[PDB]
């Protein structure tokens, strides 16, 4: 990554072995969890695009998902080129040249360009742009590994109601809609696909009952 | 998080892999325990609200509680706006504008704005304010995942005194009520619902007795 | 804790996640061993009192014993207040106010008071004073949870002498006793309540014999 | 490894126990799979040749592959000699005379000479040179221990599409070609050797479509 | 402990969490093997007497041995007083006072004196002296916990000869006497108590044959 | 250890507790494979002779091999004494004496004597000399814990050739001999003791084949 310190000191650093291991291990034991996307965001503070690409490379298995992520990055790099073509011209030693999309995706990632972009003012935010494209590719993958229809999420008679709520809101987190459509799922689907008696208990509270009211009401009395 | 270096000099840092994994693991094994709230305080000493939000979102599982916490945070953010209307008009060049509720919860915010609040004068503690709201949501969650009412706690005939006193104090930690009221609970309930023979012993010790005295008097059943 | 760097530069630091994890695991998994008191002392050096309280409070389970420690801490706060009444009237600035007992246990404290007390010369060693109160409380818990009366410990018939000596000296560490009382216990109880076969051999050996000599006599007995 | 201190002061550090153990573990779980190449590059961010030799030699098992790597390193040293025959005539001790392949690979060269070459400026970047020779040899091992030919991979009558894609892209990952040749393999073979029920669905979808579209269409059998 | 930092700088520090944890694990898991002595010395490099006392005191379990070690430290403290008495009078600020044996053992573990002794020019090596007393007691414990008579130890008929030799020399390292006695025991018992077939070869190698020759000779016997 | 830090500043350091633990548990779980020597080099960089002796002593189990190593070191110490007889007289102040074998092998070398050797000019690398002696003894141990003669190793009629080549090259590493002799064994024995089918393919590559060619050729049976 690149680390800033007190007294304005800025150092590129190698990726710590333990950080790399932790990322490989989340994929090994939990695959493309819902927890994974934000975990990637936490580990990628201050990253270089080249090292982020190395982190994608070390993932074991699940190579169909890895291809979908690579395609997602490639599509976004082409969009960047269409809006922001790198214009011709010589530049002085000590100056920066604007990024093109495949340089951001890491194919021609000189370590010096990456350091130079971060230590120019204003910063040339290649790490943020690359991370965002990776996040978009991950969101596709999480939906793919959340195979169950939202309309098929139902409380059994053996489930405590709270477990059904846990499944429902995990599924919505990994299968977005517009903010309005998701709000409609909370107000329509959640009561509808509860077990009959629990569903009756929620209806008495109302159609816009808070989740706090729903949790307190349905525990067993 | 936010480190405070030698001579009080303050810089945003990446989190350790091992901090992230430890927080994720305690939630994975124990849920939102009663132990979790002080552990969250220990891990969060100096942090931007966006990073704190990252810490909340890297938890998966237990999503009925997690959604309830997000709604609770949103209500508290609205209270901040009601109390502290944010100036829509102009500000002096260099003076930071008050935070609004969305900024405190990172939802409508840049990381640099958040750092600005922690580094300007005054160094408005937006990270501390966001943690206070997260803690309140967690305390409600801890009461939700309690499954025992303090008013029902009874020592059996065969149950030893030691088991009963452990249930009573564990439950009292999860009573999200006034601390003064908890003192009333210690004086009143603990003696009243003891095993009949041992209640007689505790009444004889009478008001002002220490727990040390109660435990030695009631060794056994 | 507080980390002291080269050139007398003393900076308060975060609780190490890993140090806190070690403390919670010992109390939860090993309970109120004899090993707990010294392990606590080693990990609680150089602690700002509110953080030291966080370290106590992030331990859970055993909640009657934990409450008994909090009560013991409050008794010590009562002694501290009686011994050192507050300096009445207007408090002159610069010099930190001399604390009350609740403030020392941390409930009312600010981080700025805590830094001020430790970084003044002379210092007010608030973290040490609180640590002494806590260690006294732990000794009370270890005594309370080692209910075997040392006078009554006997050997079985099919026991080697060593297992009895291990039990005897563990019990002695968890019994209230001056060094003079320990010396009497050592020379009175230990050989008298031994298994008949070993006790015959030890009496023939005599009283001046050390424990090293006694262990040598009873190798297979 | 080499650690860059403040102001560019390069100081060698001992091999880290936990870096070395991490390399040994990746070899234990996965052997010489295509994950090895990026994992090796990440752990050799700052490696000396001495570290690199220690890393190769500590592997247990897999000794046919390890011997093949060492011969491949011998081949690369011979290519270095052919390109860069070391000029005749005398050069003082201390002047960093050019190395030949055998010094670079490090058997016939002190650690201190190697550190001198990489850390004086301008350098003769022996650590990077040797690391590259290892990477070329590893790429051949990765091809050798791929066991499936891409032409033969069929999606069975019972195999799910996701697993067929996983197999195909691991196999391509371990038998890399020119980027254009790889792109042709993705457009031609993957659709063609899909199960016949799903291949029709893909032809309807397009004349070669994105993998994200292909995964959505082929969610059955 | 005391650490020397770069440039001959003495800094007193806390006992490392991790060093103390490792020492506590050694006594929980491995009892008083002959491996304990050197492990303890290595983890206690740099220790004040107060730190050494903290390490002894964190041991629980096996408490008869621990009590014997404390008595043994007291016996050495009495030998130190007998050799070296204390002279009357005051000492200047800037001088070191000669310690009683109890002071070296850490009974009045005044840390200021202890740091003073190791950092004065020239020093009193109080911490090393205490370590030698601890080591003497630990050796006595190692003999106590190695109950098997070495004179009974023979080769199994089913055992490989080499495993019998491993047992014999571990036992001799646990019960060590004069070097003269150990050497004679190694010559005499090891050959006599082997298998018939193996011992016949060893005598034919000579009446002083090396352990190296003995190992090569008995592979396949 | 002795750490040579930036700008040549040599400072003595404590043994790392994590370094020591990694060495000890490698030996106890994996014993003396032909992984041991390089692993020993990784964990002993910059050791003093005293540290090296600590590192061996701390290991236990497999004690007949450990005594054999101690004598191999004693034989080397006698060779050093024969080349570097004990000299008498005063010596220059600052120009440490030429060691004798007992100092190199640690017992007679105080911390001040060893520090003297590495910190005077010109420096005498007593730690390295002792490390080379230990490594020589380890190579003897590794051969003793090889069980298989390289001249017996053959590929079955049904064993895969891939397993045979792995077995051959592990065994060849654990025979003591010149690397040049090992090279002749690789080109002579391995083809001769393959199975008829594989051997016929190998002889069509003829004299000069690399393992990369040979392994690729025999992927078919």
Curated annotation (Swiss-Prot), chains A, B, C, D, E, F:
Organism lineage reads as:
Viruses, Riboviria, Pararnavirae, Artverviricota, Revtraviricetes
| Annotated function | Forms the conical core that encapsulates the genomic RNA-nucleocapsid complex in the virion. Most core are conical, with only 7% tubular. The core is constituted by capsid protein hexamer subunits. The core is disassembled soon after virion entry. The capsid promotes immune invasion by cloaking viral DNA from CGAS detection. Host restriction factors such as TRIM5-alpha or TRIMCyp bind retroviral capsids and cause premature capsid disassembly, leading to blocks in reverse transcription. Capsid restriction by TRIM5 is one of the factors which restricts HIV-1 to the human species.
Which region ranges are annotated with the description Dimerization/Multimerization of capsid protein p24?
145-221
Phosphoserine modified-residue sites: 16
**Which residue stretches belong to region PPIA/CYPA-binding loop?**
85-93
Superkingdom, natural source: Viruses
Mutagenesis or variant effect for residue 57 to D:
Reduces binding to human NUP153. Does not affect binding to CPSF6. Reduces infectivity to non-dividing cells. Retains infectivity to dividing cells
Locations listed in the record: Virion
- Where are the annotated segments for Interaction with human PPIA/CYPA and NUP153? 57-95
The species this protein was found in: Human immunodeficiency virus type 1 group M subtype B (isolate NY5)
Q: What would changing residue 173 to K do, according to UniProt? A: Retains binding to FG repeats of human NUP153
Tell me the outcome of changing residue 173 to A: Does not bind FG repeats of human NUP153. Loss of infectivity
Could you tell me what this protein is called? Capsid protein p24
Subunit-structure text: Homodimer; the homodimer further multimerizes as homohexamers or homopentamers. Interacts with host NUP98. Interacts with host PPIA/CYPA; this interaction stabilizes the capsid. Interacts with host NUP153. Interacts with host PDZD8; this interaction stabilizes the capsid. Interacts with host TRIM5; this interaction destabilizes the capsid. Interacts with host CPSF6. Interacts with host NONO; the interaction is weak.
* Part of the full-length chain shown: 133 to 353 of 500
Give the record's PTM text: Phosphorylated possibly by host MAPK1; this phosphorylation is necessary for Pin1-mediated virion uncoating.
